[PDB]
């Protein structure tokens, strides 16, 4: 096992903590040992192990930004990286039925997103963070090579429309983009008056990019009414932005499928390809 195997390390990083009481989450690049107030990231390959010093720099940079909330702060690196655990829990889509909850939750997303946008200009950031060229064309090529063979003729025609539209996108690199800003990744303090944003986790996909990507993720998680509220509060409701959001949002099923295809995750692959086959 992973706990028994890394027990010497865990005894140094978590003195007196029984390793069999911990839990391990099985990432792509990393096993993540979860303690009460922190996690230990261990690379699953020599590729990940080589990348971990950069990941630690990235997390240190995010820890320095003004985002209106917490992020996993680097506590120790050695190969391993220890990050603080952000407290709180995801906010259930149903909570947004109360219009006063929706109002304060929308406002706090605007603060988060504004903070990420502003950070996009910073130097610490632009040089620590990934800024790939043509991520969406690379994606289009990956989909055609890897997913089209699994799709129906009608599926391939729908997908080829969605991919064609990715050419409409300007390769915009103005904001820090979380890249996977679903509901599960945004943590809240609940049951102490209206919900207050604790922080944001799962920064694995973080880059310099287009903030439409993060807005699309919010809409995917909470629906169009709520996204519309965020866009209006934040002054982001022009047509140019709406088009970028829709275009990117259209790729989310295919992103799920492409990941699931590479991961040998048959449940996610099936779910991802629903209506493409």
């Amino acid at each position: 096992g992973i706990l028994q195997a890394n027990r010497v390390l865990l005894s140094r990083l978590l003195p007196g903590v029984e390793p069999e009481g911990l839990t391990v989450r099985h990432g792509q690049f990393h096993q993540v040992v979860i303690a009460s107030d922190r996690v230990v990231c261990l690379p699953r390959t020599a590729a990940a192990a080589a990348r971990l010093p950069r990941r630690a720099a990235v997390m240190r940079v995010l820890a320095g930004l003004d985002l209106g909330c917490r992020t996993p702060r680097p506590l120790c690196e050695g190969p391993f990286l220890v990050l603080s655990r952000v407290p709180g829990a995801p906010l259930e889509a149903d909570a947004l039925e109360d219009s006063k909850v929706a109002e304060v939750v929308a406002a706090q997303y605007v603060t988060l997103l504004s903070g990420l946008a502003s950070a996009g200009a910073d130097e610490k950031v632009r040089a620590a963070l990934p800024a790939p060229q043509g991520r969406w064309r690379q994606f289009a090529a990956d989909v055609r090579a890897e997913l089209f063979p699994l799709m129906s003729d009608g599926g391939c025609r729908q997908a080829e429309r969605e991919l064609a539209a990715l050419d409409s996108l300007p390769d915009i690199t103005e904001a820090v983009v979380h890249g996977n800003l679903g509901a599960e990744n945004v943590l809240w303090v609940r049951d102490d008056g209206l919900p207050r944003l604790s922080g944001v986790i799962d920064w694995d996909e973080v880059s310099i990019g287009d903030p439409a990507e993060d807005l699309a993720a919010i809409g995917a998680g909470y629906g169009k009414d709520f996204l519309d509220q965020v866009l209006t509060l934040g002054g982001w409701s022009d047509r140019r932005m709406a088009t970028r959001i829709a275009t990117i949002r259209a790729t989310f099923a295919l992103q799920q499928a492409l990941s699931a295809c590479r991961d040998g995750d048959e449940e996610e692959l099936a779910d991802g390809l629903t209506g493409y086959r």
């Binding site: 996977n180 699309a216 993720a217 995917a220 799920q256 990941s259």
Partner: peptide
């Protein structure tokens, strides 16, 4: 995991 992107 997942529709948001994962």
């Amino acid at each position: 995991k997942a529709x948001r992107a994962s």
